[PDB]
């Protein structure tokens, strides 16, 4: 009695666009076109689709099927499957905290760009400002200009010295203090996600209507804008120019495998939370199929959106779009792409809809990222929670604000890259590998096929079976071993990270991981009997 069964989605289209909003993010815009044009050019589509079909789709569909069938959170679902792995739900909660620290500061930059785009004359055009050096050299100035190693563009000057104020920090050692403008920008983001979350999936699905759809409009506007630009074919040429010798590199498949995983983000429990609220009779197979294609096709058309403007930017300069595409990261969108759209007519229009799109791309993914953890703890601690959902939502939101206070500093941009590379990447793959192995092996793939047979009415095909049994865990095992074997040496804004940054990153990487093996130690020490008896009861799920 009382509450009993959980809630359900309002409409089939709401959660369909909600999972699409979580998948489509900033990475689908800048990241995919860079790794595509760098590795093999247009030939990168061949391994990218293979890593999607074999690796990416089965994990995405397995994670989604477990959500709609069990209707449990990222924690409670392990109580009814493999209780020793219940720490997986806790690790995701620690992972999403590390994710939400930097992720909303990036949108705070795009929000600071959005609010600074309301002036008739955009600040990064002219070099006359409070934050510019004597190295600042803009256009609409004297011709014949020759660039200098020490010289800096007004857009690079604007992003370096103002929104980041990264010149005021020497590195990871001293990043202090905090920039309060980004603290207010991220506070508004934490407020707009507060009112888009606190109620539940009902408000998130409705706010997703705006946050998921608008990027495609802004992408289409910048697509038609970028296409009409003179000399935009150079970027598209360098974008789609096939290099088949790059396919012989053993690394490009790893880049394709890692790209498709982190773009779809399976096994993170967010897709598990979104599916928990759907209908039992409802079909999740057609959903996961088309949803992943949208994420890939959006990144494909986003490739033209970026490189058409990058091609025109290389047209006013001298060619080799690779050189203007040299630095990959926020500088591509916030400096190169922003300086490129500043030279176009009605630049206020395209600049507003650009950074708004960036906020629009990060809002939906941030809704679900918290939604997965909120659903996890609410389902894990029922009736000790749910007294008010705005209470637990406010607690996790303001916690991400204090966690972002380290990211809101002057050297906060240094911490963004430290957490994005070292921290989240390896542990999410590990927790998804342990998840995929536990579902396909411990719980068994036969009983999993029987649950789908009771769900949709038919057993899944042998293609998905061999993928879940072998191909999908091997897909995650491939990216793991490659990351651990070659830990990246990272550099940002003419500043090389210290040698010990990987040590600090491994601390942030293992700090989320320490829970599950200590929980397995907590489960095995509490369970009486012998090792074979207690583990069998620990391997056997809840009997009722």
């Amino acid at each position, epitope marked *: 009695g009382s509450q009993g069964e959980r809630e359900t989605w309002g409409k089939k289209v709401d959660f369909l666009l909600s999972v699409i909003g979580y998948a489509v993010d900033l990475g689908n815009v800048w990241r995919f076109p860079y790794i595509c044009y760098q590795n093999g050019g247009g030939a990168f589509l061949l391994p990218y689709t293979i890593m999607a079909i074999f690796g990416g789709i089965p994990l995405f569909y397995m994670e989604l099927a477990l959500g709609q069938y069990h209707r449990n959170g990222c924690i409670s679902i392990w109580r009814k499957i493999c209780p020793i792995f219940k720490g997986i739900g806790y690790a995701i909660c620690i992972i999403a905290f590390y994710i939400a620290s930097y992720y909303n500061t990036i949108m705070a930059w795009a929000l600071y760009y959005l609010i600074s785009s309301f002036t008739d004359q955009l600040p990064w055009t002219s070099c006359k400002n409070s934050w510019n050096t004597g190295n600042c050299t803009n256009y609409f100035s004297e011709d*014949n200009i*020759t*660039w*200098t*190693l*020490h*010289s800096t563009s007004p857009a690079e000057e604007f992003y370096t010295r103002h929104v980041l104020q990264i010149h005021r920090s020497k590195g990871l050692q001293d990043l202090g203090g905090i920039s309060w403008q980004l603290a207010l920008c991220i506070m508004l983001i934490f407020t707009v996600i507060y009112f888009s979350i606190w109620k539940g999936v009902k408000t998130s699905g409705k706010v997703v209507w705006v946050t998921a759809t608008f990027p495609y409009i802004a992408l289409s506007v910048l697509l038609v804008r970028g296409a009409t630009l003179p*000399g935009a074919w150079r970027g598209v040429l360098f974008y789609l120019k096939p290099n088949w010798q790059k396919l012989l590199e053993t690394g490009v498949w790893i880049d394709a495998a890692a790209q498709i995983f982190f773009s779809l983000g399976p096994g993170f429990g967010v897709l598990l939370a979104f599916a928990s609220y759907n209908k039992f009779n409802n079909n999740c197979y057609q959903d996961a199929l088309v949803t992943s294609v949208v994420n890939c096709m959006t990144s494909f058309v986003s490739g033209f959106v970026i490189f058409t403007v990058l091609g025109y930017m290389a*047209e006013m*300069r*001298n*060619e*080799d779009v*690779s*050189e203007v595409a040299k630095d990959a990261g926020p500088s591509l969108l916030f400096i190169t792409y922003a300086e490129a759209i500043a030279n176009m007519p009605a630049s206020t229009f395209f600049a507003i809809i650009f950074f708004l799109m960036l906020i629009t791309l990060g809002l939906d993914s941030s809704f679900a990222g918290l939604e997965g953890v909120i659903t996890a703890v609410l389902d894990e601690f029922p009736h000790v929670w749910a007294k008010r959902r705005e209470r637990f939502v406010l607690a996790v939101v303001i916690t991400c604000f204090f966690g972002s206070l380290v990211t809101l500093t002057f050297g906060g941009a240094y911490v963004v890259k430290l957490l994005e590379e070292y921290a989240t990447g390896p542990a999410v793959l590990t927790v998804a590998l342990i998840e995929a192995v536990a579902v396909s092996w411990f719980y068994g793939i036969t009983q999993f096929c029987r649950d789908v047979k009771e769900m949709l009415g038919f057993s899944p095909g042998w293609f998905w079976r061999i993928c879940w049994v072998a191909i999908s865990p091997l897909f995650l095992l491939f990216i793991i071993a490659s990351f651990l074997m070659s830990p990246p040496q990272l550099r940002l804004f*003419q500043y090389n990270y210290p040698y010990w940054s990987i040590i600090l990153g491994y601390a942030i990487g293992t700090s989320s991981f320490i829970c599950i093996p200590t929980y397995i130690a907590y489960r095995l020490i509490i369970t009486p009997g012998t090792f074979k008896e207690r583990i069998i009861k620990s391997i056997t799920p809840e009997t009722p």
Partner: antibody, heavy 119, light 108 residues
Framework: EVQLQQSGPELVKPGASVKISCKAS????????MNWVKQSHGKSLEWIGN????????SYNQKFKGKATLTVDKSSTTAYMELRSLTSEDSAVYYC????????????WGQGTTLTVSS | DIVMTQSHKFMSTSVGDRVSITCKAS??????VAWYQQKPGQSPKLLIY???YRYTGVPDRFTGSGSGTDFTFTISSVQAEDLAVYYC?????????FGGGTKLEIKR
């Protein structure tokens, strides 16, 4: 004004190593890339690679990768180029030339260094 | 990579005649081209950059033109001290390459 003074000619045996100094003056040394151009007898000019004086960042050529090593010193404002595994093809005139980051052109060249690899 | 091709290794002209040396690149350069003058026994001297523009210290008799793969280096008045070997070079893509060179022989 701007002068790039290289080292003198060198006669070395094959299989050995050789180093060529470049002395720059007349401008701000940290404001420009430093490049090295190889010219074979009767052949065209060949770009070996550049170097950034500030951090020593070296952008080489795929043809010269591992064949040449570019170094720089900001104290005396001097750039060097080292070559190992010397053959008869390596006998040629080498030039160190100044270039900006954009547009990329060689405005000032060194007087040249005559290299002869023989026993 | 990029291949700069000068089809004429030698071009015969006279003092005062209008001479034009061509250049052929691999792909479209827009306008980025540098014309150098290397006198025998001297280092290569820069003359033209961005294919229409002259470097400082270059007399008015040296011009350049063209936007595309093909470019033209034009000398209206040839002198006796103008005897040298001219090269064309592209600056966009790494690595930077040079043409085979065209030796200008003066007819008298």
């Amino acid at each position: 004004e701007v002068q790039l003074q290289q080292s003198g000619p060198e006669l070395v045996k094959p299989g050995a190593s050789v180093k060529i100094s470049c002395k720059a003056s007349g401008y701000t040394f940290t404001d420009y890339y430093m490049n090295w151009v190889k010219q074979s007898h009767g052949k065209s000019l060949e770009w070996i690679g550049n170097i950034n004086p500030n951090n020593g960042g070296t952008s080489y050529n795929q043809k010269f990768k591992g064949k040449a090593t570019l170094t720089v010193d900001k104290s005396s404002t001097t750039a060097y180029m080292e070559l190992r595994s010397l053959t008869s093809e390596d006998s040629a005139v080498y030039y160190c030339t100044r270039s900006p980051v954009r547009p990329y052109y060689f405005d000032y060249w060194g007087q040249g260094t005559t290299l002869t690899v023989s026993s | 990579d990029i291949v700069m091709t000068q089809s004429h290794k030698f071009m015969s002209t006279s003092v005062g005649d209008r001479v034009s040396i061509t250049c052929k690149a691999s792909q479209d350069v827009s306008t980025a081209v540098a014309w150098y003058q290397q006198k025998p026994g001297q280092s290569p001297k820069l003359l033209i950059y961005s294919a229409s523009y002259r470097y400082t210290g270059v007399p008015d008799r040296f011009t350049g033109s063209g936007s595309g793969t093909d470019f033209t280096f034009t000398i209206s008045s040839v002198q006796a001290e103008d005897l040298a070997v001219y090269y064309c070079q592209q600056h966009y893509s790494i690595p930077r390459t040079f043409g085979g060179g065209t030796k200008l022989e003066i007819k008298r």
